[PDB]
Amino acid sequence: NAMPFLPDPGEPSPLKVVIAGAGYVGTCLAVTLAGRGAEVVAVDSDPGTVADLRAGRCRLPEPGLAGAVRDLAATGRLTASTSYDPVGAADVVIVTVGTPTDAGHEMVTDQLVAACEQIAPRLRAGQLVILKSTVSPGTTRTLVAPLLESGGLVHERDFGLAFCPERLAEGVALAQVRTLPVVVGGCGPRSAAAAERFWRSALGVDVRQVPSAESAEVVKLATNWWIDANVAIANELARYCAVLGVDVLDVIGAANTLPKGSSMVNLLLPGVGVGCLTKDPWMAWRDGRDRGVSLRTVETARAVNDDMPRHTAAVIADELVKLGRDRNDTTIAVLGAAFKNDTGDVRNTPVRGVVAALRDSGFRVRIFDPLADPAEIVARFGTAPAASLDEAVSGAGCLAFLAGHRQFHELDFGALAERVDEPCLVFDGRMHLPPARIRELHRFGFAYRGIGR
Amino acid sequence: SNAMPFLPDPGEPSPLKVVIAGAGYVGTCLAVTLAGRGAEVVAVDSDPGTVADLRAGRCRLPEPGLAGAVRDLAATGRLTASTSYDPVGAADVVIVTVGTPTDAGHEMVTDQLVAACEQIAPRLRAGQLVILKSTVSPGTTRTLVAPLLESGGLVHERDFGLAFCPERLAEGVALAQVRTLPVVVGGCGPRSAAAAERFWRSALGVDVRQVPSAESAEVVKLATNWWIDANVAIANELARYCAVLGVDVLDVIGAANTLPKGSSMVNLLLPGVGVGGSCLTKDPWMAWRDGRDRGVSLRTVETARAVNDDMPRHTAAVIADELVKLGRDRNDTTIAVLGAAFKNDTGDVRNTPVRGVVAALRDSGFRVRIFDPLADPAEIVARFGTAPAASLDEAVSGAGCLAFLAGHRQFHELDFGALAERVDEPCLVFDGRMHLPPARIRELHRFGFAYRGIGR
Ligand SMILES: NC(=O)c1ccc[n+]([C@@H]2O[C@H](COP(=O)([O-])OP(=O)(O)OC[C@H]3O[C@@H](n4cnc5c(N)ncnc54)[C@H](O)[C@@H]3O)[C@@H](O)[C@H]2O)c1
Ligand SMILES: Cc1cn([C@H]2C[C@H](O)[C@@H](COP(=O)(O)O)O2)c(=O)[nH]c1=O
Ligand code: NA
């Protein structure tokens, strides 16, 4: 009774964890928890996803993830199911299911409601439930808690309930998840103490307590709001630097040497647009609007970042005209299609906006992303990607790096110089190449341009 | 003879000779720091009162430790002053820190800068180094200052060094920051950049961050104030959003800022009662106007300025609303505004957001008493149209509200148990810029106060 909702971490028998949702977040969580000794079962409605995990397969490009899935599924500590039945035997249940938003920027509770309606009858006294899915504030306590209580139990008294925002760093997720402190917002002191004991023992990280689940839900929304609004500042700064003939990355690097606030001045890097950062700031805006608060910094940031794909296409076409090129003699090789660097997800990518604007004007575009699924590129771009990097760049008049994947940095530009059509423009969207690499491109005959570079 | 370096070898026995044009806040902080490390400095200013003060070892600038440093160095003879620009000829380095105010259209008023350059230009000799530190619109150093300095026959970069090095001092801790902050150097060429870097490293003992041009360094200064002002806007809107959920914005900011991001961490700034001073209310508009002239729209600046300009009025509306919810009216409540300065731990009220809060409260029918022991009483009369209270007891005795609109360290050290016996019960404690932790809020309630803040 003194230590509710979690066994002593020193117990010989392993901790039993059920993770609802076997997406990017769920898989990273499952692998890192199983790796530290817990017995984990990932629950997902997709039979294909469950079949892959059970056979130690993972198609996610996240570094070290496919290897860890294959190793842990073989040790038996990582398993998967389409059924929510393993919830009954679990000590901890983590909910990472999808929470999208409609055109009005209001939560689509469907997936979360369905997951909660499956967990509720299987929920047992003494269990700990943690919500990781990004949600509108008040959701854990006013929507999720009554759904979980439909099975007769009471949150905080019979089972622990806490909101812990997901803050995974793509491309380095497995490394960051083992060091990054977890924010815990308990639905009461018992739920707060148990959620903190769980992350410290099962994950081995520090914990940052906030006084309610609503406070922790706002931490997630405030983080995405801060990131989106700071990317908007950086994007506008890059367009200002471009008209002055100054390099935005030197400006940002020098500006960020000033201590300020809780750490340093932190101008974020500009890009080709934003693709968490397009829904969560609007989610806070709609919540604010319904409560009589206008979030003007969110409205402006979204308008600024939504204009960047069209501006990127305009800059590419303008630079090609300056090189004496046109839509009749140039094929553009778009290298990298994913919304974020070192990911393969193209579901909500600003690259779609760049390609559409380049095609809408009349340019021939080839797409290549070594991390993305070719069927997903067909679905989102409407065309099959190039068979390989060599096929994409051969005879291309422009190499537009619109996602800065690590394998693009390891490319031999001397070898690329022999495949492309001279004069070739290297447009740097998300590579953010250092001056030493830009000199190498010029040496091989490439023209180089970035927004504000 | 060989092409010349634009700075003498710091191995020479004679002290470095520096001339600082513009002995205001930035100029005086530089002068005492350079002279304190051994350089011989002459402060050149158009105000005869400032020149007379520096000569006598006096300084009217309230900046902590500044008057003391001036007194010590005037006695050594290393720091002197002049209304005349005749010391320029003998100097190794000329630093320009004159005022660059903007007009109603946010265009820079070049009057002081042109007058300074015109006096410097014919006294310049080959091999000298000229550093511009005043905040300017990009391209000012190369297209305005350089041709004015060349009127004597010298050619910038070939005959003398010209660099832009922005000042990044924060008011109240300027003397501590001038000796620690890395200096950004934007030379008009490689020789100017090398000399300016060697100058800051050897004469100030600080690190240097080179940027490729004077224009790049001019943008660094404007991008910094743009970033700060826009991030205060995010924080103020976040506090207003937290207020409707009843969540504490300081818990949210603290937890959010534990995430590594960019080149450091997520850095949500602290909310307040608005934004004052020249830096954050003028510099982002200067960038906006320069961008507009060149066909670039800075929408984040427009929104940040609108958001922060609305904060004083919103703060007064919150105080008035919380007083009504407490059962207090305009008839039985005198509000004591504690802290008038634009910033915590300074006395500067020249452009303070507290002015807007006080004016909006009075326009709601409330009597307001002002108390700020760090501020000049005459400065409060000129900005607020009323004399501040003689003492803390006069301000708080019988007050129905204690509105902490500047969070000076002095206010954190008050005896709230004693205050509780002087105020009119029930007394509202409004936290504008104290940012009290939950333990301190609990203590106020135990003493009988009603604590409120935006998003607290
Ligand atoms: N105030 C700050 O904290 C701060 C911080 C960073 C940057 N800056 C920039 O530094 C510059 C100076 O700021 P400040 O607050 O010290 O200014 P200030 O207006 O208070 O002082 C300027 C001084 O220059 C003198 N002066 C004017 N024209 C002159 C001339 N032709 N010859 C000689 N002296 C002349 C004036 O008499 C005055 O004493 C501004 O461009 C400002 O943007 C200020
Ligand atoms: C840094 C900072 C400044 N401000 C406001 C107070 C001052 O009026 C103005 C300038 O502050 P600064 O000189 O400390 O940057 O901006 C905030 O409200 N929150 C903050 O976090
Ligand atoms: Na609260």
Annotate B256-325 with DSSP letters as a single string.
HTTSEETTEE-------S---SHHHHHHHHHHHHHHHHTT---HHHHHHHHHHHHHHHHHHHHHHHHHHH
Smallest CA separation from ligand 1 atom 38, residue: B24
Which amino acid would we find at residue A377?
I
Domain B246-456 has CATH 3.40.50.720: yes
Compute how many other C-beta atoms are within 10 angstroms of the C-beta atom of residue A209.
Answer: 18
Among B241, B242, B248, the strongest candidate for a mutation testing the A interface, having the largest count of A CBs within 10 A, is: B241
Cα B21 to Cα B117: distance, rounded to the nearest angstrom:
9
Cα A194 to Cα A100: distance, rounded to the nearest angstrom:
29
Strand order in the sheet with A331-335: A364-368, A331-335, A398-401, A425-428, A447-450
Alpha-helical segments (H) within B180-213? 190-199
Query: Cβ neighbours of residue A331 under 8 Å, at least 6 residues apart?
Result: A363, A364, A365, A366, A395, A396, A397, A398, A421
Task: Give bridge partners of residue A94 from the DSSP assignment.
Answer: A19, A130
Contact A232, B300 (CB under 8 A): yes
Q: Report the candidate in A64, A58, A117, A430 with the shortest Cα–Cα distance to residue A275.
A: A430
Cα A36 to Cα A19: distance, rounded to the nearest angstrom:
15
The structural domains of chain A, with segments of one domain joined by +, span 1-211, 245-453
Residue given tokens 């931490």 in the structure block:
A219
Q: Report the candidate in A394, A436, A344 with the shortest Cα–Cα distance to residue A59.
A: A344
The H or E element that residue B40 is part of is strand B40-44
Which amino acid would we find at residue B368?
V
Contact A147, A139 (CB under 8 A): no
Smallest CA separation from ligand 2 atom 16, residue: B275
Contact A405, A336 (CB under 8 A): yes
Which amino acid would we find at residue B243?
A
- Regarding the beta carbon of B282 and ligand 2, being less than 6 Å apart is answered no
Q: Report the candidate in A102, A175, A101, A156 with the shortest Cα–Cα distance to residue A133.
A: A101
- Are A230 and B262 an interchain contact pair (Cβ–Cβ within 8 Å)? yes
Query: Cβ neighbours of residue A354 under 8 Å, at least 6 residues apart?
Result: A272, A273, A309, A312, A313, A316, A334, A400, A402, A429
Going by their DSSP bridges, the two strands A364-368 and A331-335 should be labelled as parallel
Which ligand 1 atom is at minimum distance from the Cα of B50?
39
Given the candidates 3.90.226.10, 3.40.50.920, 3.40.50.720, 1.25.40.10, the CATH classification of the domain at A1-211 is 3.40.50.720
Q: Residue A418, exposed/middle/buried by CB under 10 A (0-12, 13-18, 19+)?
A: exposed
- Are A295 and B241 an interchain contact pair (Cβ–Cβ within 8 Å)? yes
- Helix %, strand %, coil % of chain A (to 5): 45, 15, 40
Cα B233 to Cα A229: distance, rounded to the nearest angstrom:
10
Q: What tokens were used for B229? A: 């002002």
Contact B342, B352 (CB under 8 A): yes
- Regarding the beta carbon of B62 and ligand 2, being less than 6 Å apart is answered no
Cα A186 to Cα B252: distance, rounded to the nearest angstrom:
14
Contact B449, B424 (CB under 8 A): no
Identify the three-state secondary structure at position A255.
Answer: helix
Q: Report the candidate in B112, B117, B45, B115 with the shortest Cα–Cα distance to residue B80.
A: B45
Q: Report the candidate in B265, B208, B113 with the shortest Cα–Cα distance to residue A227.
A: B265
Contact A38, A93 (CB under 8 A): no
Cα separation values, B71 from A130, B36, B76, B374, Å: 63, 11, 9, 21
Contact A184, A199 (CB under 8 A): yes
**Residue whose CB lies within 8 A of the most ligand 2 atoms, among B63, B266, B343, B434, for a mutation test:** B343
Contact A338, A372 (CB under 8 A): yes
Contact A401, A408 (CB under 8 A): yes
What letter would DSSP give residue B204?
Answer: I
- Helix %, strand %, coil % of chain B (to 5): 45, 15, 40
CA-CA-CA-CA torsion for B352, B358, B360, B364, nearest 10 degrees?
A: 180
Cα–Cα–Cα angle for B247, B253, B258, rounded to 5 degrees? 130
Going by their DSSP bridges, the two strands A128-131 and A92-95 should be labelled as parallel
Which amino acid would we find at residue B306?
A
Beta strands in B89-182 (DSSP E): 93-96, 129-132, 161-164
Task: Kindly give the distance from the C-alpha atom of residue B210 to the centroid of ligand 1, in angstroms, as a whole number.
Answer: 24
How large is the angle between the packed helices B66-76 and B25-36, nearest 10 degrees? 50
Compute how many other C-beta atoms are within 10 angstroms of the C-beta atom of residue B3.
Answer: 6
Cα separation values, A367 from A122, A337, A377, A396, B192, Å: 47, 7, 8, 11, 46
Q: Torsions phi, psi of A21, nearest 5?
A: 105, 115
Task: Give bridge partners of residue A93 from the DSSP assignment.
Answer: A18, A129
* B54-82 as b/e: b if 16+ CB within 10 A: beebebebbbeebbebbeebbeeebbbbb
Identify the three-state secondary structure at position A161.
Answer: strand
Identify the three-state secondary structure at position A62.
Answer: coil
Which amino acid would we find at residue B129?
L
Cα B45 to Cα B98: distance, rounded to the nearest angstrom:
8
Q: What tokens were used for B51? A: 């020149």
Q: What tokens were used for A225? A: 């709001």
Cα B408 to Cα B432: distance, rounded to the nearest angstrom:
11
Q: Is the peptide bond before B10 cis (omega within 30 degrees of 0)?
A: no
Q: Report the candidate in A34, A51, A280 with the shortest Cα–Cα distance to residue A174.
A: A34
* CATH classification code of A245-453: 3.40.50.720
Q: Is the peptide bond before A9 cis (omega within 30 degrees of 0)?
A: no
Task: Kindly give the distance from the C-alpha atom of residue B243 to the centroid of ligand 3, in angstroms, as a whole number.
Answer: 8
Task: Give bridge partners of residue A186 from the DSSP assignment.
Answer: A162
Q: Mind telling me how many Å the CA of A276 is from chain B's nearest CA?
A: 15
Residue of chain B minimizing CA distance to A220: B256
Class of domain B1-212: alpha beta
Q: Report the candidate in A311, A342, A329 with the shortest Cα–Cα distance to residue A427.
A: A311
Q: Report the candidate in B202, B209, B204, B237 with the shortest Cα–Cα distance to residue B224.
A: B209
The answer to whether domain A1-211 and domain A245-453 are alike in fold is: yes
CA-CA-CA-CA torsion for A323, A325, A330, A332, nearest 10 degrees?
A: 40
Contact B83, B48 (CB under 8 A): yes
Q: Report the candidate in B265, B275, B263, B262 with the shortest Cα–Cα distance to residue B234.
A: B275
Smallest CA separation from ligand 1 atom 1, residue: B25
Q: What tokens were used for B63? A: 């900046």
The H or E element that residue B50 is part of is helix B48-56
